[PDB]
Amino acid sequence: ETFKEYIEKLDKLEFEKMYENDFFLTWEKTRDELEAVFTVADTLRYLRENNISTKIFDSGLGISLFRTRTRFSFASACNLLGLEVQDLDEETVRETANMISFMADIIGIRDDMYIGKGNAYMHEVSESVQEGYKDGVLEQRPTLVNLQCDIDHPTQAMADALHLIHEFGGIENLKGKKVAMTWAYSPSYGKPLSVPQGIVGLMTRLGMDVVLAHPEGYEIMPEVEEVAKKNAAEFGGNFTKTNSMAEAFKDADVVYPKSWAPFAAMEKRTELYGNGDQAGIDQLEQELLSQNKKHKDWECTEELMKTTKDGKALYMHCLPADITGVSCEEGEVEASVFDRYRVELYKEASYKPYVIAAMIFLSKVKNPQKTLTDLADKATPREVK
Amino acid sequence: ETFKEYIEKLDKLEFEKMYENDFFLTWEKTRDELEAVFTVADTLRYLRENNISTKIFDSGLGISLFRTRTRFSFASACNLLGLEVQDLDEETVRETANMISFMADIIGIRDDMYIGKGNAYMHEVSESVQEGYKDGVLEQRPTLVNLQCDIDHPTQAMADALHLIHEFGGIENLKGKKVAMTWAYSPSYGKPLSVPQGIVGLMTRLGMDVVLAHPEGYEIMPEVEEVAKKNAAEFGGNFTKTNSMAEAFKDADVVYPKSWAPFAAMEKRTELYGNGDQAGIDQLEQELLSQNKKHKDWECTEELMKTTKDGKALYMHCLPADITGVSCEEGEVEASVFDRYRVELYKEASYKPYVIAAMIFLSKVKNPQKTLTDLADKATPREVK
Amino acid sequence: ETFKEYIEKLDKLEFEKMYENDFFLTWEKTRDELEAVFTVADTLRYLRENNISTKIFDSGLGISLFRTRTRFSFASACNLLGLEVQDLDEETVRETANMISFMADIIGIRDDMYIGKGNAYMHEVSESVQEGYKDGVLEQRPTLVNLQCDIDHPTQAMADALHLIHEFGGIENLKGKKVAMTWAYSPSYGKPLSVPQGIVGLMTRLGMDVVLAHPEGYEIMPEVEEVAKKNAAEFGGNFTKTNSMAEAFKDADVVYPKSWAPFAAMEKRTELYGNGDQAGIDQLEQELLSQNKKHKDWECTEELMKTTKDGKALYMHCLPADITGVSCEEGEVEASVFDRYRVELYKEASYKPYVIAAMIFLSKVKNPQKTLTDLADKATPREVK
Numbered sequence A, B, C: 001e002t003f004k005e006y007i008e009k010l011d012k013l014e015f016e017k018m019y020e021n022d023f024f025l026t027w028e029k030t031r032d033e034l035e036a037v038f039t040v041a042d043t044l045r046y047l048r049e050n051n052i053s054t055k056i057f058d059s060g061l062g063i064s065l066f067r068t069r070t071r072f073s074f075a076s077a078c079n080l081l082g083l084e085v086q087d088l089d090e091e092t093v094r095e096t097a098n099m100i101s102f103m104a105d106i107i108g109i110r111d112d113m114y115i116g117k118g119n120a121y122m123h124e125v126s127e128s129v130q131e132g133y134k135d136g137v138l139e140q141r142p143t144l145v146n147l148q149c150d151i152d153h154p155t156q157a158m159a160d161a162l163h164l165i166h167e168f169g170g171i172e173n174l175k176g177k178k179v180a181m182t183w184a185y186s187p188s189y190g191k192p193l194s195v196p197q198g199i200v201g202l203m204t205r206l207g208m209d210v211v212l213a214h215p216e217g218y219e220i221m222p223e224v225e226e227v228a229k230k231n232a233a234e235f236g237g238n239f240t241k242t243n244s245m246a247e248a249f250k251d252a253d254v255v256y257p258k259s260w261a262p263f264a265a266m267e268k269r270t271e272l273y274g275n276g277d278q279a280g281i282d283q284l285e286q287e288l289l290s291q292n293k294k295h296k297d298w299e300c301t302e303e304l305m306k307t308t309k310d311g312k313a314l315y316m317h318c319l320p321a322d323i324t325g326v327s328c329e330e331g332e333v334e335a336s337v338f339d340r341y342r343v344e345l346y347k348e349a350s351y352k353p354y355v356i357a358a359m360i361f362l363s364k365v366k367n368p369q370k371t372l373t374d375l376a377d378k379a380t381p382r383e384v385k
Helices: A003-011 A031-049 A069-081 A092-099 A117-134 A154-167 A194-206 A222-235 A245-249 A263-275 A278-295 A302-306 A335-364 A368-378 B003-011 B031-049 B069-081 B092-099 B117-134 B154-167 B194-206 B222-235 B245-249 B263-275 B278-295 B302-306 B335-364 B368-378 C003-011 C031-049 C069-081 C092-099 C117-134 C154-167 C194-206 C222-235 C245-249 C263-275 C278-295 C302-306 C335-364 C368-378
Strands: A061-066 A084-088 A104-111 A143-149 A178-182 A209-213 A238-242 A254-257 B061-066 B084-088 B104-111 B143-149 B178-182 B209-213 B238-242 B254-257 C061-066 C084-088 C104-111 C143-149 C178-182 C209-213 C238-242 C254-257
Touching: A003 A031, A003 A368, A031 A154, A031 A194, A031 A335, A031 A368, A061 A069, A061 B069, A069 A084, A069 A104, A069 A143, A069 A335, A069 C061, A069 C084, A084 B069, A092 A117, A092 B335, A104 A117, A104 A335, A117 A143, A143 A154, A143 A335, A154 A194, A154 A335, A178 A194, A178 A245, A194 A209, A194 A222, A209 A222, A209 A245, A222 A238, A245 A302, A263 A278, A302 A335, A335 C092, B003 B031, B003 B368, B031 B154, B031 B194, B031 B335, B031 B368, B061 B069, B061 C069, B069 B084, B069 B104, B069 B143, B069 B335, B084 C069, B092 B117, B092 C335, B104 B117, B104 B335, B117 B143, B143 B154, B143 B335, B154 B194, B154 B335, B178 B194, B178 B245, B194 B209, B194 B222, B209 B222, B209 B245, B222 B238, B245 B302, B263 B278, B302 B335, C003 C031, C003 C368, C031 C154, C031 C194, C031 C335, C031 C368, C061 C069, C069 C084, C069 C104, C069 C143, C069 C335, C092 C117, C104 C117, C104 C335, C117 C143, C143 C154, C143 C335, C154 C194, C154 C335, C178 C194, C178 C245, C194 C209, C194 C222, C209 C222, C209 C245, C222 C238, C245 C302, C263 C278, C302 C335
Parallel strands: A061 A084, A061 A104, A104 A143, A178 A209, A178 A254, A209 A238, B061 B084, B061 B104, B104 B143, B178 B209, B178 B254, B209 B238, C061 C084, C061 C104, C104 C143, C178 C209, C178 C254, C209 C238
Antiparallel strands: none
16 A cells, blocks of 8 residues: 555544553543554555654663563664664552653553552552653653453454454455364463453454354453454444354464463462462362363364365464474474464564554644654665665 | 753863763763763753654664663664664673673673672673774774672662752752762661662762761762762862761751661672572571661651651652651651652752663764754654654 | 775685584584675774674564683673673473574574583474474574584684684684693583584684694594595595604694593583483592593693793683682693783683674675675774774
8 A cells, every 4th residue: 555545544533542542451542542543554565665864863762671582672672763672670669650651752661470550550559650741750651561461452453453454455355254262282281361351352343253162161351252242233243252262263263372371370379479479379270270171172174174164264472482393292283283373473473563652642642643654754774876 | 951051061171081882880981071060961851752763773782781660761762863772681790791792882781680790790791892993803992881789880870969959959069969879778688789879989079078877787888988088179069977867957958868788798698699698698688677677767857857857858759768657657758748859859850861862872873063053953753743 | 904805705615514514513614604704803893993783683582592701702702793682591492492483583502511412402402492483483584603502612713713713813823833731731521512613623724733732632523524524635634643642742833732621521410410410420520520630741731832832822712710729729831821921811702702793794794795894884882982
């Protein structure tokens, strides 16, 4: 698409509320706001593809706050816009939020290890930073970008959605398509549910036919099931739950098989972690290990792919995947399946840097159309031509 | 204040000796030189508040040299001026000083754990770097900024002084004001004396009525007492020593209650550390723990605040403070007292980034007035307007 | 030399193949290509010496990939050209190579601990990154700079060669000169052979009279001996092997005495490391310790220096050196010898940042003459004048 087309698309969307605001969960934003992230994403790509610098800050920091793929993804986005990243180690939160912010425009936060704690922690940082700006402590109001929490993974989900839009030739062609978000076997102890919950909560916004397929006992956060049901019932398409991998793969257009630990188990883990009972934690993680040992047959196999739409549904995975007979003895996907989609899987990952930059752009530029246009006319070369 | 006023103030100060020089101790600089740091501090703030970039380096490094609040403070200052920070791990010093400096304009150093070692280490680095410049090894002469040593904490003290100037409406209104630099209870083993010595050595320059209040046995470096006595006797005001917290708080205009380990004890600690005797160190730190256990009553309490000027002296603390019943069982300050000054305490901290930038600016720009004016006329936007 | 002279020198060299290519081993490049690195090195120095910024990237990353002197050397080079460095911790390599590269223009790699593994690892990264560019995963093709491997140390060797060119007044004056690359005693377990192999493989290109002097049993990689023999026999000068330190020092114009572990021993070490046999490794390193204990007499001494050309051959060492009676009980060089050449040794090290920048420049600028000239005419100040 040409540059004129991108600007014209933004003009028929409404997104004034994204300015000087945070980004936590995809479903806290409107459909227009989500579409403004996609379009600004592609616009920044267009400009960089044509050797046009999109630096919008002459100085200022972006605070990275972990508690290494998203590490480089955030660093990339900041540098593209002209921000310099600083990493932080790991009313105390209020104090930490003001002390790091004096010359910070952005704060990216990853906190995904504990159910309940991660999302609340980001709200506290935002609130603290809002008050500091009001009380004159801070010259600006830093906007927060959720780089992964216990509830959602918005940068991953939106990068995944944008991949689909480009693979199927527009956001409207996603309507009616069948996406299988399923569980798969991992040797690992227990992975967060942010990706499964994140793409189920997002794809349901895009009018798709979404199916959540996991073995019994691996239920996701029930409040995210409720968000998906609403989404589908309100803005078209469907949401379905099932305990059969085959039933989900059958006639699927898209396939997303990644493992996760049971929501309930993560609630226990956090309470035990809060109580301090390390002996209980060790037992819980051993109990999970042998529970998911009973579902090794959950693997994205060449036989399963065969029962997909034309035997070639787009395989998606956030990476890295557990590849059977390469990364581990038994895993999420067969080697030959992975290899055949390798190019698509990497191209999928390429959208993440642009998605974070778009979120930053939208939260810091009151008139994106004008500034994007200003940046295009000046045409500052990022490389020597 | 307007921009014209800042330049005119610099014009009636003399500071030619700050160019291509280091900053170690506040009392090694003249009163005019100190006032040039305040004014350049406020000028850079003025410019950034009005969206005007103050980048003065197109490329070059600022070497950070620790041996996380000042970490971000130094990184902020460097980035504001256009320098990129690089962290170093922790005639060998001479070699290290030349090898890191080839494309370094600034070196910030924090070395505050051992009495005698820290200040000597910075002199050696400076000297090495001076000689390298003379012998053609180095294209430039990197200027050093003391980010905290065993003797003084110049960036903290000057940020604290600048806070006062803005709270009381000018540097001349500080004359006659009563500042209580006192000890307080901390559960921690033993904190450096750089802050207490630093603000006693600085506030005595500003014609204030300074009182050093600590329990018997907690004497500061006696050479810093001598600097304060001289300061007061020479440039007006007073310096007093006392072993009563109440007597210091009575009618105080400003109150600075932070704990520190006895100077003498720090001399032992270093000798033991030099001798290698770890068994002695462990005993010394246990001996301190129960010594300051006998002075839990040294706390900035709501009853003490009540005996201050109008019951509302400006509470100052470098942060973080030991808050009783929040951060610890028994600490430096009562929660309600802390909370009521929280806004001021954070605003105090905001001056540190600008103080470091000013020191850098003054050490690298032969004509500050002209360049500050050049930067104002060009008016390069740091953010999109 | 003036700027006009540098450009004219580049014009009578051919180096079109360096564009969008990697730099692994000095002997994989032509003599003209090597001379293009020297000239671009000196040109960037000339420009910076005259306060002229040489930033060529407005945004983009340089990935540093270790597996602290070259750390700062790489960071310096990147920043000079406008790139921002990001450090990485330590088909998986293929995945890692694409995931870090989305907005990376350069990748510097240090991997020098294991014979066979290091050079192969860089070829795999390059190949992966090449394919990604072809398949549309990557917007650009990142060029690799070998920051040190098991075979060569190209940035060190070229910095060393450039030092010589400036010490003896041109690359043509090196012809006929006698360079003693010799072993020396180190207390350390076992150092890589990349420096000895690197300068023997390079100096033989420059028509010099190179002698490899090491005690029996310390043979270097035999394939690098073969490269040196060829070099000398093909492009003039000589290569000789000897087991006498004196014979190598006699009438030497240049002296390079640094220790290294026997090539053969490094082959064992890696196999043991590959087999996992840690008990064998511990024994092998103890066997080396007492082997080189039998050659403490291999020291660059004041008596040896006396038998050099005029008793003042240029002493060279990559640094840091083992100095006898300062850094250790017994080492590579006598203190008085080291001290007298300290200035030259540091100036030698100063070329490394410019050598890395030159390699980057040549791999990313299709017309160096034009852009270097463009940068000179614009004359963007790096410092305020």
